[PDB]
From TrEMBL, chains A, B:
Origin: domain of life: Bacteria
Domain HpaB/PvcC/4-BUDH N-terminal: 4-270
Protein name: Chlorophenol monooxygenase
GO MF entry, a single one: oxidoreductase activity, acting on the CH-CH group of donors
Alphabetically ordered keywords of this record: FAD, Flavoprotein, Monooxygenase, Oxidoreductase
Record-linked InterPro entries: Acyl-CoA_Oxase/DH_mid-dom_sf (IPR046373), AcylCo_DH-like_C (IPR036250), AcylCoA_DH/oxidase_NM_dom_sf (IPR009100), HpaB/PvcC/4-BUDH (IPR004925), HpaB/PvcC/4-BUDH_C (IPR024719), HpaB/PvcC/4-BUDH_N (IPR024674)
Gene label: hadA
Length: 481, 481, 480, 482
């Protein structure tokens, strides 16, 4: 059947070597600093067993077996919308897209290998013909069958951006041995989200100038592999769910993976050795994460606009003309992200393997627009709230004999329900005035590369030209051709 | 048959009373200050007779008569996209959207009356039953049959914004008599575009607090109607078509219409007397204009991004990383305008008479997003050009035996064709650095109300509430009942 | 003699009734939620006894008494710069302007009273001649003498912004009884910073339409007055100073003060009963908090520009031309705050009592320019750091026998010193990505009214006219 | 005496070879396309003869000669503020800062040479001891004695930015001969303002990477030098001064200068040969024009904010709270430009020659701040006007028997004076909605390099390191060593 939450939490007790800040984690599923976000993954798995959600969360495969939608391939626009409906439902069900790396997101990128596996094999260098397209498809089919969480770690160490000669010194993961059975790898995958909570690490790399072949590695290994150490930032999870209804639900840890002479059988190596292959194929893997981030950006905008409507209605600024036009900014932002999501689905194309991909240019520029504006939109939500965004009663101040009477009168705006301003306050404060929400803004700003990086890669990949179909209108107006 | 350019130029010599700055106009079709823009309408009609454009420019109605697509009703998504393609082709064929009130735009707004003529009659006050749904339909059918340009004049005078007392001292058009033949109107329709080049004036009004019943008028009268005087700003048309390839094509005049005891028969009056009717119904008339705005916004953004690509290629800054990401901004802006347009088409609804209308929130917030960003985008196009946007050879300077070799070397960038930099500069200069191009920015900024107006009206119209479907997600996250 | 830190910590244990979140505080000086910030006030008082800082931190008065510069009155430009240099050195000494309401700032507004004390009396209504302009000056000179911290609480409750009538039902502090000994006040001062840490509450009011006379209260009372309750948000202080070098130094708490039938003698009442007097004179009180806010804006801008320089150097991006222009924005922002501070001092004027005041237009518009750009400037600093703002070693990770070699190598940029990037990361994280740093952003944004508030109040007070010497040039160019 | 306006008009008819668009110019003083801007320079010269302005416009030198304040050297802050009050007065009397390259601006850069001439000589390469510091000083004394306008042409051809190696094929002015009498130069000074209206061309370069040594020429030659052609864009002057009260006052033409084997004597050669000299010293030359640009930015911000007050008052939006905070934006900008100007004066330093210079970081970052915000400030003024910015009566429409009554009622806002709204519109239209207005914006945006250039150059020249003053506080807070 489809994996359950209990099966997930049980499988975390597997020997994995995990730091979270200054601490060592006995069992990710039960430790104070990690159990809350482990239960969030459990909840994710449990949503696929909820009968009111079976139509949206699951599908019948051609074999007759019911599967999680996170394994659903899409070959047309209607199939894309069904996938987007699944991703959207998962992030709405889970604290308003507050947990952006649920397994559905992690595993989405695997579909690029399924679509066209051969080039990974044929462009390899130094595998002595042991890498097999069939084994790539086999690993992914294995992930599907067991509902395994493959956490992607691709990005380089942030060592020294001064040098193009930097990558000779790199502590980045390299191949130190190749034999009949597989490769041995040594060094760091410098950054990943949620790896302490995953089953398998999806290893990969982006091209950088001068990248040696022994650091071009796409492969998979279990989180509990001997030689693997997960090294995570301190947990930001909060002990009081009444004061912090979002931040008490757990912290989606980020951190690095140390590999000490780790063995990886050829059956789980997708490609090694070719810098050129690392140019466009890695971008094709992360495309699916870029499209997904549009779904998130839309739910996030919708939340921020919503919270603006609620708080201005409750303090009674909502009918002040100058505030109406500020709330219109946050609402316009949401409609903009909605427009880009729907436009990307309309203007899509079929890949080599005949999968339907949404419009690259629309979702990538949609992400750039989100990152350009997001912090201004949070400034606006906080600014519209005035003091109610931070200076509200603790629940015990509120319910105290002496203080209750004063609290209730100070929060007596036009839509009654005085305690409700404390509820809106709590969510605004968790989402954007705590360590826990600040991490989410950093994740959002960096996970798919930041604003200048999005723009640079999109232009390098598009190869826009004066003589290209881009310029036809300009050329005609100037009388060139 | 479909009206020809020749027929239209003939029809302009009808004794209409026109000021264009300090001059009176004997014949708008031949006067130096108007003939170039009169020929631009002539070109508009003539497009409908190009054999290679007949599928795009025309359709076959239920009688078997061929008609210009400006009279085409859209009853579903596919018919809308077919209407948008027509509009897109019209503005691409006419100086890349430099003439935004061609007759297709002007007459689009009449489809609201056709869709649901009855409320215009039934809600009329003081007409003594004289106004009939049938005659509203009969006028619009008469406009169709003769391909008439009905220029909309709705907006008030801009006299005193400080108080609502403003509508009693207003020279705004008022009914001074009602008899059994029709109405006599006296006063001003303060602002119109292209009236001097129209066949009929489409009179309307928007609600404002305390608007008297006698100023609520929706009617139609010929431009040459006795007592109608058309008073236009000075003409910005340029004399040298080589130096000003766009500004020499003609100036789409704006200005005001004086009515002195003008008689309109009941046959040509659509509604009078009801301020409440003027709240929602006029907005419904201009929805079609706001949608069309989105189409122009896309084509304008595509021309701006194309000029950025062209000029940065020509001066050889296109591969400079820091410039590449500035050009990403302008391309990003175009993709945002493409997303809103397609998304509005995708997320539309059926009106009372079963016409398909695009999503009001998406097209209205698309216009907001364009007005908020437009000046920044012009500034980046001009800033990326350097001196080449303004300081370039006149054609006699370029071709002088002595100066030619110096200009050739000065404009010999990485893609050669040195004179092509003058071709691009001329277009940038005309669009963004002449009185002629400034007028178009000002039109674009005000015609559909400015940014703070779009935001206000859109919010007032949408009755957004925290209880409504909008605040659903935020309420769930906040734990509000 | 100038008060010591020890003396100040001792005096906090005076029975003051304080909530911090869900907890009651028996002693503000020693409770884990409050002791660190309390010690920051104790540090403040001790900076005045340092013989190496004496020439900046203290002055000799007419009597020959060494007094703290927080009590120094400036009558010319030179003297205003000496006061400012004091405020600057205080904010550099205390974790880069991270504690914006040290006593020097709190007590600065009292100089408006010292300058023109009469009106406060002469415009009072229903006091029966009990309020003396003599007794306001006596209080402030008593505070001076005993280096007393007087915390300003003027702002209204945020109840209902739809209704203008909603100043009658409001729990705003009102005068319920006026007798011969003094007044009795009941209700709420809805918002204050650091009141739990202060000696006295400075009770004021700003004017809103239809403010009733019984709600127009300018007064002072001790923080431990019977019937006073201090109610503060939960404390955001961090446990581990290694991981959180700024957030572990303590949380400058914000809260409300509840007054339950609180008696205030006439000697400690400044003004009552006149909505008219509450238009101009309360703004003139907070003008000094406003000027000071520009000194902080400059130092905060300087701090942010210096972290941008430190972090872009350490990761090796500082020479990438496109990063260079982004660091340029943060450096220019600093220079913009510097320019406004120095311009405001140059174009100052004398008040009625002969005090030198910096230009109101410049320091107030300087504040608007800060609020407008600040969140975009934080965005640039964080964006410029990349992962290094947040994803970095904990200290036990750094030091581990297995991880040290990896961390040393991953952090080895052009200016070597690999652990230095963790130090920069810890400060960017604390300043801008914690509970603690966010409150400083919220405080900056609201304490002096938000941007749309600064703009409208500045316009309404300036009363800018087409016919006044603003559009002088515009009239001339127009032929009007 | 100080040179008069009329004397200036006579000096223009000196055989200079001048294109303005497709037309050759016989006399810049009198030609329809140039005569108005020629009269604005004549007005400049006549301001120094107005007895009501004698104190502001002129000084007495060490020999008792009364001289135009454009030649006044400032050795402290009081002197700098006297020079700034002079520049401010000139731009206020001349169409509210609408003519940014009056002779006072052009001639201001020459003070860098006067301050410290030796390095122009000592750093010269391949001159064989012919370039003399005393002669740079003698040229500037001669300029001062004849009140001559030296127009500065420094910037390169905008040919190909793709590779520095492309400067191989660049038609930028090069030395094509050095002999005992002087040099011969051939090619283009690609860009300059008001050269058609100047007496002498001030020639220079800025370092770009790969600039060829043979293009490193700092010199001066007359505008009518044989082998010089001035080639200007088309004139944007307007016919009807009632309808265009600013753009009818004339067009400060921009363009390029062609040198065909032009002879410059060693006496008028300041420096040749050394790209390394061209890194710092040319920026010191243009510093004075970056300071001046801040004075213009304050007067221009003052004008915009004023126009915003005047128009919102007239249509009656000025008490609408939402409009009130938008006008605060325009006023805050003016305040910001003021703040930068006054801070830069307060925080100035003495140069090697003893001249007082205002603070470089503050005037240049104030310039950056203006280029970043200017486009948005003009949008705000135009957006605040509504239609009053463009759609208003022409004067004959206003005065018509039939339309007057409608126009008077349509313009009858809370401050009466109906025709004043047309007057405000005319100014708003001319500044921001004509070709003449667009050229000023384009001038302000590029003349002192654009935003990304200002920022890039200020960072390269100040070299702000983590171990310098700018990292002192952050190091302390982070506990990093110094
Ligand atoms: C919270 C979180 C979570 C994750 C990740 C990051 C973070 C912060 N990442 C890695 C993420 O993609 C990465 O941080 C970004 O790509 C940015 O890279 P750097 O941190 O190295 O900044 P980097 O040093 O590249 O950037 C520094 C700053 O300088 C600018 N800059 C740098 N080089 C420039 C240039 N040449 N021109 C112009 N500007 C330049 C950048 O734009 C940026 O503003 C990741 N990765 C992964 O594979 N799987 C994962 O799950 C995650 N998860
Ligand atoms: C951290 C902290 C610390 C302090 C304080 C606040 C905070 C948050 N304050 C109080 C502070 O001055 C107050 O929060 C601000 O004046 C903003 O007021 P409100 O919070 O009531 O917002 P309010 O409800 O007034 O405003 C909320 C939002 O709506 C907008 N808005 C409201 N009315 C509007 C209108 N009519 N037109 C247009 N826009 C409008 C505002 O611009 C803002 O964006 C304070 N006070 C004090 O006296 N001493 C102190 O020490 C402190 N300390
Ligand atoms: O480093 N990179 O090139 C990246 C990293 C992440 C991403 O989503 C795209 C590209």
């Amino acid at each position: 059947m489809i994996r359950t939450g209990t099966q997930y939490l049980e499988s975390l007790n597997d020997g994995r070597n995990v730091w979270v800040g200054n601490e060592k984690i006995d069992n990710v599923a039960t430790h104070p600093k990690t159990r809350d976000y482990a239960q969030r993954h459990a909840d994710f798995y449990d949503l696929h067993h909820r009968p009111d959600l079976q139509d949206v969360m699951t599908y019948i495969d051609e074999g007759g077996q019911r599967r999680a939608m996170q394994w659903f391939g899409h070959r047309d626009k209607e199939q894309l919308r069904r996938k987007r409906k699944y991703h959207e439902t998962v992030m709405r069900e889970m604290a308003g897209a507050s947990f952006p790396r649920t397994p559905d997101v992690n595993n989405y990128v695997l579909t690029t290998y399924i679509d066209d596996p051969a080039p990974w094999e044929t462009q390899s260098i130094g595998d002595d013909g042991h890498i097999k397209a069939g084994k790539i498809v086999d690993f992914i089919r294995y992930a599907r069958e067991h509902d395994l969480n493959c956490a992607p770690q691709f990005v380089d160490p942030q060592m020294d951006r001064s040098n193009p000669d930097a990558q000779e010194r790199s502590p980045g993961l390299r191949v130190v041995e190749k034999n009949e059975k597989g490769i041995v790898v040594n060094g760091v995958k410098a950054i990943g989200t949620g790896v302490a909570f995953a089953d398998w690490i999806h290893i990969g790399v982006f091209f950088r100038p001068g990248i040696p072949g022994d650091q071009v590695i796409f492969a998979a290994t279990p989180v509990n592999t001997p030689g693997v150490t997960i090294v995570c930032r301190e947990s930001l999870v909060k002990d009081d769910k009444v004061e912090h209804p979002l931040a008490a639900q757990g912290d989606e840890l980020d951190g690095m993976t140390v590999f000490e002479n780790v063995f990886i059988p050829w059956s789980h190596v997708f490609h090694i050795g070719n810098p050129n292959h690392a140019k466009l194929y890695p971008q094709r893997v992360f495309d699916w994460l870029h499209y997904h981030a549009l779904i998130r950006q839309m739910v996030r905008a919708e939340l921020v606009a919503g919270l603006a409507v609620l708080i201005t209605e409750h303090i009674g600024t909502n009918k002040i003309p100058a505030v109406q036009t500020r709330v219109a900014k946050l609402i316009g932002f949401h409609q903009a992200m909605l427009a880009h999501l729907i436009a990307s689905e309309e203007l899509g194309f079929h890949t080599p393997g005949g999968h339907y991909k949404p419009n690259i240019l629309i979702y990538d520029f949609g992400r750039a627009l989100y990152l350009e504006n997001f912090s201004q939109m949070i400034y606006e939500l906080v600014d519209l709230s005035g003091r109610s965004a931070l200076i509200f009663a603790s629940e015990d101040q509120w319910n105290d004999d002496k203080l209750n009477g004063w609290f209730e009168r100070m929060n007596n705006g036009p839509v009654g329900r005085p305690h409700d301003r404390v509820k809106i306050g709590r969510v605004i404060r968790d989402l954007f005035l705590t360590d826990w929400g600040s991490r989410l803004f950093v994740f959002e700003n960096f996970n798919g590369t930041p604003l200048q990086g999005i723009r640079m890669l999109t232009m390098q990949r598009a190869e826009f030209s004066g003589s290209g179909p881009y310029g036809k209108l300009a050329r005609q107006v100037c009388g060139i051709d």
